[PDB]
Design a protein around this ligand. Sequence first.
Ligand SMILES: [Mg+2]
Ligand SMILES: [Mg+2]
Ligand SMILES: [Mg+2]
Length: 275
Amino acid sequence: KCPITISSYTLGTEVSFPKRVKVAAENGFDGIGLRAENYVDALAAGLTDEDMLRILDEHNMKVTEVEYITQWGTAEDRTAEQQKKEQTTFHMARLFGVKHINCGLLEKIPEEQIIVALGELCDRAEELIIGLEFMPYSGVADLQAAWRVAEACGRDNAQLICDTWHWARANQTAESIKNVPADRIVSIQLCDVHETPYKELREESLHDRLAPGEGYGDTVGFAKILKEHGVNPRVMGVEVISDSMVATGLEYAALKVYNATKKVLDEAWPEISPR
Ligand SMILES: [Mg+2]
Ligand SMILES: [Mg+2]
Ligand SMILES: [Mg+2]
C-alpha cells in the first residue's frame, strides 16, 4: 500500500486545516501532508491535536507526510526555534502515525560536518525516519550525495526522498540511483518542471512547479526508474508548489494535480495509481 498524498505546499499556506482535509478528501487523496507551520496555525485557530484527529476521521483521511526539518547542519543554525520545530515535527509524526519526516539542508557545509550533523539529527528522531531530500541548490545537491552522507552517518533511520522537481533540476538519471539500496528511499514526491529554469532555482521550486507529467522533467521516466529499482515508497507525495494554481482555486489545484498524478502512475506504476 502507498497512500497518494497531497503535499502541504500544494494547497498553499493559508487554507484552514478542516478545509485542507475536506478539499483533499473530495478530490480522491488518501492523505495530506502537513508542515509544522500548518500545525501551529491550527493550534492558534483553537484546534487541538484531538480535534485534528476527529476531523481526519470525519473525512476518512490521514496525515501521511510531516515536514520540514532544516537548519540542522551547524551549531549556529540549531537555535531554540529550530530545535522547537524539530520537536514539533516529531510529535506530529507520532500523533498522526507518520513514520518518516521530510528534511533538507539548504546550507552548503563541508560534507564531513553534514555526516556528523545528520547522525545527530537521526539520534534526536529516535524511532522516526529522517527522509533526507536532495535539492540542486542545497548542501546535498544530488541523490549520490544524499546517499553518501546517510550511509556514512551509520544510523539506520537516515533515509532518502526523491522529489521529481529536484531530480529533474539536478539533471539526475538512471545512473543516479546506482549503489543506493532501494529500501533507503522512504518516499517519492511527484510533480514536474518548466522548460526554462528560473534564474533563482529556489524561487522556482517554492513558487512555480508544474503538475506531474505536464512539464519537461519526464515525471513518467522518473517514476519508472524508481519502480524498476525496487523502491517501495511509504507515501507518494504530490508536491506541486504553484502560486498560480492556488490563486486560481484550492479545488482547482487539488483536481488538477490528482488527475495528472493518475495519468503518470497509470502509465509508470499502475499498481499504486489512485483508483
Ligand atoms: Mg506564498
Ligand atoms: Mg519535496
Ligand atoms: Mg503486488
